[PDB]
């Protein structure tokens, strides 16, 4: 039967988060979570976010008939990783996909891996070890219109991006949040742009600045706004659109900017707070309309390890701007 139409749960038979979609052989392709209730513990570094593997979902139109198209990854597959399949992304280039997503290696340290196919159904073969020089969480891989490809990634807390400082992981005994200053600027995002063949990075990983409206960096204390989880990419008009989730404050936030790097200035909300502690989108282009995807946890009576997929359309004005989207208004 078609969903998406007045923001209820795009698919039930499964719990499904963190939805990534894209464009691809004119469906759209969705590729979040699989959550699933392992009842592992609960805690500030995420252990009770467990899954074990990735659905690859399509749909011809918005609202359609959502097809499971089954497992595309296992993680007993993949060879280098122990545990925590988090959110995911694809991306397509030269008639191969490429299934890109953050898993804990056998060290416990957070990794981001690249599995291929030759359909964006999947399934996909995963590498034999994570990308080189990657590591944390909620990897998006970005197309450029210049044909550059860029990954955008980093969590702070359970996704470990403030022991990243040094190019070496700071260990099982340092910060489980942030860089616990304050009045510092806030930790930023990751990018690097890809390799031609799309399995590795093809410069040394940069950190991306935020800045307020008057250039300012967004500072460690500015929870409403600082950097946490789910980098996401789009272009619009010339533009360049950061968003993100905010975490304990449980925005999807945006910035913008003129180039793939930054700076990006931060500019508002997309996305208040849900039913469940984690907030994780996408924006895409399709059919001419723009649409913000997302999650929560309605469909399991508010568990916020057991989450569903949403869709709704999403406003930009010729300004650049874009309209706040509340999640249970209309
Ligand atoms: O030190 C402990 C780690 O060993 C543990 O890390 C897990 C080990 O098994 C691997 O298969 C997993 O990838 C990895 O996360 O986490 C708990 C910690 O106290
Ligand atoms: O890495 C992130 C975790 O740090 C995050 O943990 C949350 C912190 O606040 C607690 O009240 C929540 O229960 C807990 O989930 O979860 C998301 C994960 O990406
Ligand atoms: O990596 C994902 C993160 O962004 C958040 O949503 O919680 C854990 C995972 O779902
Ligand atoms: O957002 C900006 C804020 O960070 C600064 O402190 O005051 C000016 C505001 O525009
Ligand atoms: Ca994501
Ligand atoms: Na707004």
New binding site residues.
Partial sequence: VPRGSHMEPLVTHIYTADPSAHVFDGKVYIYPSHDIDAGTPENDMG?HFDMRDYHVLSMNSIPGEVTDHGVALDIKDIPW????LWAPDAASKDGKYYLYFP???????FRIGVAVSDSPAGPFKPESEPIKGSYSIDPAVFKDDDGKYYMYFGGIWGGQLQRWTTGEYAG?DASKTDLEQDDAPAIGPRIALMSDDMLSFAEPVKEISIVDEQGNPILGGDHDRRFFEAAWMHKYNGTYYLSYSTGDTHYIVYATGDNPYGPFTYRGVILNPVIGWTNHHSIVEFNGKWYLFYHDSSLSGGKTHLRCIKVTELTHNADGTIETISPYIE
Avoid: P, S
Avoid at 81 to 84: D, K, L, N, V, Y
Avoid at 103 to 109: N, R, V
């Fill in positions: 252990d990783a122990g545990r925590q898993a804990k290696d056998k060290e416990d340290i099982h």
